[PDB]
Amino acid sequence: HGSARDISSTNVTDLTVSPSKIEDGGKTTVKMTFDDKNGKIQNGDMIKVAWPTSGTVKIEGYSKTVPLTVKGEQVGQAVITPDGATITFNDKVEKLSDVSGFAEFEVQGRNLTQTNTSDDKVATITSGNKSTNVTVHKSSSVFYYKTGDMLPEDTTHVRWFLNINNEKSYVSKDITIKDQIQGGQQLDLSTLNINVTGTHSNYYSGQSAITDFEKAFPGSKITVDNTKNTIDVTIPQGYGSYNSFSINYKTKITNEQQKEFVNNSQAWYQEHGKEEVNGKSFNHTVHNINANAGIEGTVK
């Protein structure tokens, strides 16, 4: 083996990113194709896919590891990281002739400077001699809404956010949130944490996150059933008023092949001056990351 040979400039034939126009924090798919027309692929050879990691635009590759297989035999590996993508070939690729393949993976585009100056919002993804462009457009809230995403550095977990009383308005009754986490994922209790902003501004994190919250706010109860994957939040009207409650938590993925991860929640609240909300649905769905890699060759 020895040192890894960068064969991106010689072997890469096409690099395409679709869609070419995305919003801030949007997802887009990158495809890289290669063949051994210009040079025979050897053991230890690597193909690199590079993109901007800092500046005006940021591209973050969702962490995935996809094997390159010919007739059940693994001949290569596709490793995607938040800062780069690498295609590494082993000794089993040397027995193959007329070799051709591809690497398809999803990335996240970010507009860091938040700009509309055309050239700054364009992210250039490169692989050898091939280059392609991605346009990343730059970025009042309701009382309660629920959202979530998957981190580019960690694909095994799905983040969830329970944003309660976002405008810090006075409330006439006790705020009740009944959350239900659907199948294909398991709640990690240690990754809870609650962020409170307003009159009672404090951040509660760690193992004692629930205990410290219930002590600082008497009457409050974050009931967690780990087996049933349900979180029941009760906040008294005295502490619910003039305060914003952001409840985060991570869910470990048990079903790898599952395409959608769903979280459901019902809300009971009434802003003083507004109509009473009685069990209105506030649901969110997070899509799983798609990554595929194929390779063809003749054993001869």
* CATH code at position 286: 2.60.40.740
Task: Give the Cα separation of 163 and 177 in Å (integer).
Answer: 11
Same domain assignment for residues 37 and 85:
yes
| Cα 178 to Cα 212, 229, 257, 271, 283, distances in angstroms | 21, 11, 28, 18, 11
DSSP state of 211: H
Nearest to 105 by CA among 148, 71, 61: 61
DSSP string, 181-207: E-TTEEE-GGG--EEEEETT-EEE-ST
Same domain assignment for residues 112 and 159:
no
Neighbours of 217 (CB within 10 A): 22
DSSP state of 10: H
Q: Which residues contact 233 (CB under 8 A, 6 or more apart)?
A: 162, 164, 175, 176, 177, 178, 179, 221, 222, 223, 245, 247
- Is residue 257 classed exposed, middle or buried when 0-12, 13-18 and 19+ CB atoms within 10 A define those classes? exposed
Domains of the chain: total: 2
Same domain assignment for residues 119 and 155:
no
Q: Which residues contact 202 (CB under 8 A, 6 or more apart)?
A: 196, 216
- For residues 128 and 10, the answer to whether their CB atoms sit within 8 Å is yes
- Is residue 11 classed exposed, middle or buried when 0-12, 13-18 and 19+ CB atoms within 10 A define those classes? buried
- For residues 171 and 165, the answer to whether their CB atoms sit within 8 Å is yes
Q: Which residues contact 9 (CB under 8 A, 6 or more apart)?
A: 128, 129
Tell me, rounded to whole angstroms, the distance of Cα 63 from its chain centroid: 9
Of the candidates 138, 153, 174, which is a domain's last residue? 138
What number of residues does the chain have?
300
Same domain assignment for residues 125 and 170:
no
For the chain, how long is the longest CA-to-CA vector? 79
Same domain assignment for residues 174 and 185:
yes
DSSP state of 150: -
Same domain assignment for residues 148 and 225:
yes
- For residues 270 and 172, the answer to whether their CB atoms sit within 8 Å is yes
Same domain assignment for residues 168 and 276:
yes
Of the candidates 108, 138, 168, which is a domain's last residue? 138
- For residues 265 and 164, the answer to whether their CB atoms sit within 8 Å is no
Same domain assignment for residues 134 and 187:
no
- Domain span at residue 189 reads 139-300
Nearest to 59 by CA among 29, 86, 34: 29
Q: Which method was it determined by?
A: X-ray
Q: Rounded to a whole number, what is the distance in angstroms from the first to the last CA of the chain?
A: 24
Structure tokens at 104: 């398809």
Backbone phi and psi for residue 79, each to the nearest 5 degrees, phi listed first? -110, 115
Same domain assignment for residues 177 and 133:
no
Q: Which residues contact 148 (CB under 8 A, 6 or more apart)?
A: 158, 159, 160, 161, 261, 263, 284, 286
Task: Give the Cα separation of 41 and 19 in Å (integer).
Answer: 30
Same domain assignment for residues 70 and 179:
no
Instruction: Output the domain CATH number for residue 39.
Output: 2.60.40.1280
- For residues 245 and 164, the answer to whether their CB atoms sit within 8 Å is yes
Same domain assignment for residues 284 and 161:
yes
Task: Give the Cα separation of 207 and 227 in Å (integer).
Answer: 18
Cα four-point dihedral sign 80, 83, 85, 88: negative
Q: Give the containing element (helix H, strand E) for 215.
A: helix 209-216
Classified as helix, coil or strand, 8 is helix
Same domain assignment for residues 207 and 223:
yes
Resolution to one decimal, Å: 2.0
